[PDB]
Write a protein that binds this ligand. Structure first.
Ligand SMILES: [Ca+2]
Ligand SMILES: [Ca+2]
Length: 134
RNA sequence: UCGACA
DNA sequence: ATGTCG
């Protein structure tokens, strides 16, 4: 019955408002050790943050030759990564430039690299808050 | 239009 | 509010 794979990486987004200030980080699911944390972005959506978090985790694991899976509680982000396309509705303008810039580069990375990293759904309703929660 | 879920 | 799905 979906055992928690503790040998994995968990990521999550943190924000102040939605859309609003967004940041994300990845931790060791087992210990909670923070493996990476993104500098806050002035304005972005929760989902863009969830999305960027997985893609960065994907890059973090690849460059370290790790086959560990990644846990995300975002149904949306998980699909965006699966499709290699972040279907965000956030308006594109001077204010949202940076976030979209990161989202586009994330998509670009996905479309130019390969990986076998399993992207798993973290079940908050059963296991509590994802370990990388803010 | 109605809702379900993350 | 952001998103997917029927
Ligand atoms: Ca989350
Ligand atoms: Ca959270």
């Amino acid at each position: 019955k979906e055992e928690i794979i503790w040998e994995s990486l968990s990521v999550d987004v943190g924000s102040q408002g939605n859309p609003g200030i967004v940041e994300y980080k990845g931790v060791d699911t087992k210990t909670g050790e923070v493996l990476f944390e993104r500098e806050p972005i002035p304005i972005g959506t929760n989902n863009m943050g969830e999305f960027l978090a997985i893609v960065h985790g994907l890059r973090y694991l690849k460059e370290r030759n790790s086959r560990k899976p990644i846990y995300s509680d975002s149904q949306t982000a998980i699909k965006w990564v699966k499709d290699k396309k972040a279907k965000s509705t956030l308006v594109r303008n001077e204010e949202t430039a940076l976030i979209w810039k990161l989202v586009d580069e994330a998509e670009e990375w996905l479309n130019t690299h390969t990986y076998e990293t399993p992207i798993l759904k973290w079940q908050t309703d059963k296991w509590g808050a994802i370990k990388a929660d803010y």
